[PDB]
A paper describes a structure:
Here we report that the 2-aminoisobutyric acid hydroxylase from Rhodococcus wratislaviensis, AibH1H2, requires manganese to functionalize a strong, aliphatic C–H bond (BDE = 100 kcal/mol). Structural and spectroscopic studies of this enzyme reveal a redox-active, heterobimetallic manganese–iron active site at the locus of O2 activation and substrate coordination. Metabolism of 2-aminoisobutyric acid (AIB) in Rhodococcus wratislaviensis proceeds via the initial, selective hydroxylation of the pro-(R) methyl group by the monooxygenase AibH1H2 to furnish α-methyl-d-serine (d-MeSer). Previously, recombinant expression of AibH1H2 in Escherichia coli enabled its structural characterization and revealed distinct mono- and dinuclear metal binding sites housed within the AibH1 and AibH2 protein subunits, respectively.
Collectively, these results indicated that the incorporation of two manganese ions and one iron ion afforded the most active form of AibH1H2. To determine the locations of these metal ions, crystallographic studies were performed on active preparations (entry 6) of AibH1H2. The unique locations of metal ions were determined by analysis of the anomalous X-ray dispersion collected at either the Mn K-edge or an anomalous isomorphous difference map stemming from diffraction data collected above and below the Fe K-edge. Two AibH1H2 heterodimers are found in the asymmetric unit. Both AibH1 subunits display strong anomalous scattering at the Mn K-edge above background levels and lack observable density at the Fe K-edge difference map at Site 0, supporting exclusive Mn binding at these sites. In contrast, the dinuclear sites in AibH2 appear in two distinct metalated forms. View 1 of AibH2 contains a dimanganese site with a fully occupied Site 1 metal and a partially occupied (∼60%) Site 2 metal. View 2 of AibH2 contains two fully occupied sites with predominant Fe occupancy in Site 1 and exclusive manganese occupancy in the solvent-exposed Site 2. Since this latter view represents the only location of observable Fe content throughout the structure, we hypothesize that the bimetallic arrangement of View 2 represents the correctly metalated form of AibH1H2 that participates in substrate hydroxylation. In this scenario, Site 1 is the expected and observed position for FeII binding, as the coordination environments of Sites 1 and 2 contain five and three amino-acid-derived ligands, respectively.
Numbering used by the authors:
A (entry chain B): 11 to 375
B (entry chain D): 5 to 374
C (entry chain A): 29 to 378
D (entry chain C): 28 to 378
Write the structure that this text describes.
Amino acid sequence: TLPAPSVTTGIVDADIHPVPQDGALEPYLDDRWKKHIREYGVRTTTGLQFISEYPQMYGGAMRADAWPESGYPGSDRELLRTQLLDKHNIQLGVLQCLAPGGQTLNPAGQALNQELAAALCRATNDWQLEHLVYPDPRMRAAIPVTFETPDYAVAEIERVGADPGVVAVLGTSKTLEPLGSRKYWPIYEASVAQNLPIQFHLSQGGGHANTGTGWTSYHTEYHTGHVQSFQSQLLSLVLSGTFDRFPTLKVMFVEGNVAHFAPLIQRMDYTWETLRGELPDLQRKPSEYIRDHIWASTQPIDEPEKPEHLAELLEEFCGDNVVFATDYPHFDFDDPETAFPRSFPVDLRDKILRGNGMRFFGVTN
Amino acid sequence: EHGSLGTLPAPSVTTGIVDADIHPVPQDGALEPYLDDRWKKHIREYGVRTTTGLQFISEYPQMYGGAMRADAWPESGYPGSDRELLRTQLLDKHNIQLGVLQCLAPGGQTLNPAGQALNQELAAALCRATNDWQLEHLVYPDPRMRAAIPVTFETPDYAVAEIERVGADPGVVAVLGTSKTLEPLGSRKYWPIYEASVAQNLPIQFHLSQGGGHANTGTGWTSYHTEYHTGHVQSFQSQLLSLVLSGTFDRFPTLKVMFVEGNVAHFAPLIQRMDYTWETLRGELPDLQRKPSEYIRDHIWASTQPIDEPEKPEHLAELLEEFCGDNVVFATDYPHFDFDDPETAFPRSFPVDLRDKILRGNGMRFFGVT
Amino acid sequence: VPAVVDCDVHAVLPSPHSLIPYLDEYWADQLVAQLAPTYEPNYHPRGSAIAQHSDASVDENGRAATTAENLVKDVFADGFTDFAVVNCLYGVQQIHQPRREMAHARALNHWIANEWLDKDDRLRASIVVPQGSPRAAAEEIDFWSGDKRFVQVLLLGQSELLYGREINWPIWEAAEAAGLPVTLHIGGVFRQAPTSVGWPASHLEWYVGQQSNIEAQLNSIISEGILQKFPKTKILLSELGFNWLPPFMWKFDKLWKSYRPDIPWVQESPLELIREHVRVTTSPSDGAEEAGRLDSIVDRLGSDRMLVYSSDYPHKHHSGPRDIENGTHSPELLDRIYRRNAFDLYNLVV
Amino acid sequence: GVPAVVDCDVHAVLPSPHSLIPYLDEYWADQLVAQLAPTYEPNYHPRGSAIAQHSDASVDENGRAATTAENLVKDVFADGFTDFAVVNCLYGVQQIHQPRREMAHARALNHWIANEWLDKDDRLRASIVVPQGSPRAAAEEIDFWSGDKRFVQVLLLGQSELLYGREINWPIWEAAEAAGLPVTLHIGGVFRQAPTSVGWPASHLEWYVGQQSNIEAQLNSIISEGILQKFPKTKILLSELGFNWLPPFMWKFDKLWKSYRPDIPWVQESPLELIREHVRVTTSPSDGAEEAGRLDSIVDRLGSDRMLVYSSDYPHKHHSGPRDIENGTHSPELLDRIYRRNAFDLYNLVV
Ligand SMILES: [Fe+3]
Ligand SMILES: [Mg+2]
Ligand SMILES: [Mg+2]
Ligand SMILES: [Mn+2]
Ligand SMILES: [Mn+2]
Ligand SMILES: [Mn+2]
Ligand SMILES: [Mn+2]
Ligand SMILES: [Mn+2]
């Protein structure tokens, strides 16, 4: 029986992207799904056979130094051990597998054939546990599930959610309905029953354009634009009363940035002062939900012009609910040694690196 | 309905006809005896927000006179808001013995389907109030009329609860959905509603709608009114393909669905293309138990209005039979402007036996009239 | 001396019938024959608490801001304000039929000109444009460019395509040619879900979240090249908050540095471009009115030139038009906000 | 001079984006290599599915059909029946969001067709691929190729970002008419909304059958918005989108036009007529019109024998083959119109 995670001298890394080597998922995939992939690929919300609608720019958006002798960055578990876990003393490294093969962002849960999507989520969860987590329990799994077919996702959370190698449920930042919709409540119910928090990672797809007012053109628009989905999701999860129904549910927004949440929440409260009549069932003031329910990981770290502004904004969001991440092996990887500005308080940096993630994932020393 | 609750007798079609699409509307305030205080207050302060940026109208408002026949206006209210006028101008005039009410408008200031309110708790309350209203004001006073009960397809929990609440009432003959949805209708999302309908032995009618969450075509919003009105058939085409190819009728082998006011003739070349494509590409859906067009006779019905008008009238009967001659059901769409009269709807050379079963036996089979 | 300009107040169209004097017979007769569907938007639902504060004068139907006499009476009563920029948000941009969109937009601008501008020389207005035909929107801008009481172009925060798309360059061209700033005002065409994750279930959720679309718009406007192709461009963000701007600006700056060769015409940092070309109205203030927060947000913006005073009359917000003074200790900053920053937009003297 | 037998829809398949390098400027060629050359191969005919290539097709070193002119010409012209073939390359440049890159790769793709296909066999013609996310750039791409008469039509996808009748898209129709080129709508799309009005089809099979719904939308947009009065020499070819759906659409649209004509007063001819006179359709797939009597029936329901034009849709595999359409008719006159006369209206190609 795998031991519980332990963070002592090291740090929490809430976002790591491993990749299965070619064929690594086949031992866990039913035969009916293999043939389907060979013929159809993993069809999703594009008209494209092999790539997503916004393919990465320079060098697949990966660190130039993170490529194994063969295979794609994140596909060599030795290189991940030495180049990431050993090199930064990561003692809880949370895996978020965004692709079933050598791609950078093509989520299993977003396959339009949702039976295929559940199968691929299943294989991914079996693979990451045998290949990565059990051989090196410094890593633990955020398990992808099919958020757009809650029956399948509840089944998967029941199948593997209690495994001590699993520390969270993994969803995507973009969805067909905003995440406070009742559609997803069975998933929140099943997660709470397994004592699992939920991580929503940056994604493309989802069923709508990547902004609420058209598809973006240039890279600066696409990448900056990822923040917007998370703003919309926070507003729905809070205002829908989801945390009234599920008062122990914890959710983390992963790689949506952090600082922008603070003015968003401030605007939310301010508007709610006038317009709260529309939502009379909501039991608390909107900003009061953040502390017990809404977490955010740090990468890619906000870089204000005046460095001081970072700690201020992180505290105005919630300093207890900010969790460190590297995003290894992506190109905008954050190094825990160098991500924080010089004047940053040590208390805040220490709990971002340890306590904050420990409490989110239910970890003790 | 899989156990009936109530003493009202089941419908009897002997010498009259079936009208599968009739639009009543509540008089102002007629729903308020059935609405919680919180929703009356909500509506007064916010209206019924839906998938538009408009306070009072839908994104494609009606063109000529609200698209009602100019002779169906009462002393006071909107067309379809007078119960006596509807009884004399429609039920008596055309000897309709089973007229199915398709209430998609709560009424007064708001004409969008209850189910499409973005506040789904408000949507569920509007659907429920509608069903209480239409059963007390129309069906039970004149049981020639029966209710297709609107439910919130986009929140299946609430729709299941409504179907369990009134779905066994003999005044109810169908579940009423819209033609536009956020996901195609074969999606697993809607399966709990199909399950609840089956448990009550209720068929489902999907009426022409705007809204849904997407543009009104799969390739952009329409400009002119010819594009809007003709474009309605596209949603039905997409819904038929989804419901069949999804295997929804494998899961629910007794489920009956009718597409209401989506025309009929276009379904036949659509189904034909579906089979042809499936001959090559069937391997993508290995669990689909039947050839796509075989689901039609057992599962897919369509109403007549507005009647297809081919240039050569002989083509109507051909295409109706190519769709399925047993599954085409008459409708007037009283009181809309393209209202079809059973005396004049069909073209002079139409086969009489096909015509008779469209007016009688086909609807009786759909609605379980025996 | 630069005038105190109320940079966002509202005219509310009584009903579509108010357009009949300004419509050709074809559209006037038709209007009547369609039973006059109103395109009153739901951006500020008439029965909700934001629609009008309790001190605003009302008409016979209980509605504020439906006449220039009522608006002028309220806005200028205390003598502080010298001019007010009128925005009519009547939903012509949600008319799908493109010719009717053009006709009603023109008629609405005529209504503003004849029943508002002609009645008080302290009023200015934005030009409402049929945004669904950018070529026609350009022609609308040209048409009103000779009336200098129209001081800006009105665009909704949610559009059909992003405003930086080449399809929309005729609007920016025409605005620059007329020497007019372009304002984005909360509101939308609603031709997709208002967020990238679907349809907000309440007005409150929608209203708060439209700031996300303004990030999309500004990134599209700048990355696509509007500020280099049309370098005299001026952008006013009206009634969309502003505290969200610094975290957006910093991320945009950081990725502009990662992605320079993708957009080579952008040779200045988006930080400086935004500080130089973008102004923002102060109603709502979204918590910047609290102690010290106005100095703080100006520090975070890195410029004291961006914020311009507005009341957003007749709307009700949690703090009032002059409550921003509690958030700063600097009379010089308040002078920028009340007078000097808007001079860059309209060049209006007292 | 006798009108030629024209195969009105065959496909060239781009091997990889690396095939575009010899036709890109150094900025775009260097960019593409630095990006690791992501492929915009579409999913319209998934390369492993039964539709992608018939069993009797010549294949390259990787098993793929129609990636070289030599393979296509060997197959398409083997039996001597076909005189010319119109090549459509569906490589997904229209799904490139970055509008500069859409322009560059569309241009490079047309160069690839010109140099490695049209230059290689004088029986081939081709459509012009355009960057349809910038209609004004799309018009300039039509113009760029307007002097090379081996390009015979303009390629648009069935599902666009905005309906093709919207004024935003008028530069495309105007440039096509000015160059004397028909516009073809081919199955496929930019996928910038759900492919249907009710959301995302969950399988390729559902998607493929249902794109006919979008062609009704496009035709109603094109005609209602006035394209056929404003650009009265316009010709539209529907390529690989079926055609049996056309009559019931035509009838409804005619019926409603009789009521709504004052809404679109420039449309003084019935749509029925406008469609018969301006729209042509390729015959692969035949969607069951190849069954006995069914081709005579659909021509009767269309009310015109001028709309169907022959195609094989090479290399794609359909339930019935390119000339099985003969089983659906008893008229040699109709078959002569479908095989050669109808296409003469589009291309004016003689034997
Ligand atoms: Fe990441
Ligand atoms: Mg309460
Ligand atoms: Mg015939
Ligand atoms: Mn990343
Ligand atoms: Mn009806
Ligand atoms: Mn009707
Ligand atoms: Mn305002
Ligand atoms: Mn083809």
